[PDB]
Write a protein that binds this ligand. Structure first.
Ligand code: A1CM5
Lengths: 99, 99
């Protein structure tokens, strides 16, 4: 799909058997999801944005189905206000910006 | 132009006679620029992100030429880690997401 930007670019995702809504975010290098129990081994990490930093659990090789398009990669889990699909996964589903 | 996301979608903007680079950010509702000298009256405002909130100076009806495309709209100036072009201006230059 082609998505205009008059509204937030929210898509439906499937991760860990759970269904969520997530913002397709070209301003995010990596994917950040609100707290969830994601199976696997994880390493602590810190990430920063507007307003400061949050502590997240770094998970590698996580399967996510983004708008029906499958991708595997690093997924950060922590206290983000919103689920964010970052460029690490946008590249796998072939997402481009167009103007 | 069509832009892949293997690298940050950074573009050159011209605002207030000054040249800057700014991130095309579909996850940002609003445009927020690193500290800069913008002529005009401005209103105090607070905006939130991953780490919390920052105080910014709000400038309305500001002209920006983003990658050679002209847009006029609100520009927030404050302690952002990176210059971000948000949806309020991306819609004006016809930016879309495509996958
Ligand atoms: C400038 C910040 C940006 C470049 C440094 C990085 N960020 C992405 C932005 O797209 C962000 C998305 C966002 C949307 C929300 F609705 C809520 C929220 F908390 C975050 N937008 C944002 O802060 O926008 C501001 C301005 O507009 C407003 O609307 C939206 C909120 C307000 S990040 O998320 O911090 C982030 C993502 C990933 C990493 C690692 C994994 O790489 C680090 C950091």
């Amino acid at each position: 799909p082609q998505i205009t930007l008059w509204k937030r670019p929210l898509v439906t995702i499937k991760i860990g058997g759970q269904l969520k809504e997530a913002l397709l975010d070209t301003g995010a290098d990596d994917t950040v999801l609100e707290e969830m129990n994601l199976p696997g081994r994880w390493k602590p990490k810190m990430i920063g944005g507007i307003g400061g930093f949050i502590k997240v659990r770094q998970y590698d090789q996580i399967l996510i189905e983004i708008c029906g398009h499958k991708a595997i990669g690093t997924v950060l889990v922590g206290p983000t206000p919103v689920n964010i699909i970052g460029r690490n996964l946008l590249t796998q589903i072939g997402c481009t910006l167009n103007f």
